[PDB]
Design a protein around this ligand. Sequence first.
Ligand SMILES: Nc1ncnc2c1ncn2[C@@H]1O[C@H](COP(=O)(O)OP(=O)(O)OC[C@H]2OC[C@@H](F)[C@@H]2O)[C@@H](O)[C@H]1O
Length: 238
Amino acid sequence: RWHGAGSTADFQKIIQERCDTYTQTIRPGSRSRNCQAIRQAFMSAFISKDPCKATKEDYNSLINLAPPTVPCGQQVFWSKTKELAHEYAKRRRLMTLEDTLLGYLADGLRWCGEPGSSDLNIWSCPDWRKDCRTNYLSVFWEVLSERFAESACNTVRVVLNGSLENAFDSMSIFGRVEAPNLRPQVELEAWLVHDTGKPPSDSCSGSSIRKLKSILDGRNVKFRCMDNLSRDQFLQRS
Ligand SMILES: Nc1ncnc2c1ncn2[C@@H]1O[C@H](COP(=O)(O)OP(=O)(O)OC[C@H]2OC[C@@H](F)[C@@H]2O)[C@@H](O)[C@H]1O
């Protein structure tokens, strides 16, 4: 029926296996979490529901079992720079949304259900643009990101793309959901990083970054911006 690719095959085995791996081998030590119950709640959030009627409220319980909250001073946001941001985070022992329990579970997966069926639709899922924005995949990421930003604390960093005309996209999840919900009085450092072998098309002085400074002022978040750095200069030396 839908225009988007179907659900990841064996989605529920994957999220349970990743849950075991994460809670036991990647980030253990804190409180215990039951991975069976986390998988059950994840599945119950969307399974057998209208795939284009997802609400943020459908995920409150799942998120409550494992909020996406990162230790003070270790949190990293990104926008149009996913792989660079993850390399940077890994090197510096920081955490992106993909390094939280739920983000780790969901990273790179697709899922949707179908009314009157207990199973995932593995043939097609709603596309955000061609079908509906109110789909379980897109809504999960928006609500998880919101909670991610609300829990941020002390210094947080963001990696943005200085090779685009607008390194800050106000219609992005970083622009629309994360920056505007960022816990007040944290401090944000932005790095605008450009493709090796190309001059940067955006800077800290550009229009888009001015919009971001405006948002951060309203949250009483201090802002430091660095730019004109190649991926190599940025990584080799932030
Ligand atoms: N871990 C993920 N795995 C798969 N898809 C994801 C993931 N995280 C987000 N998406 C989706 O892919 C899309 C990415 O769109 P960009 O324009 O490159 O960047 P932003 O929108 O700013 O999202 C990134 C920030 O917000 C949350 C934090 F992770 C980041 O700081 C997005 O719409 C999501 O539906």
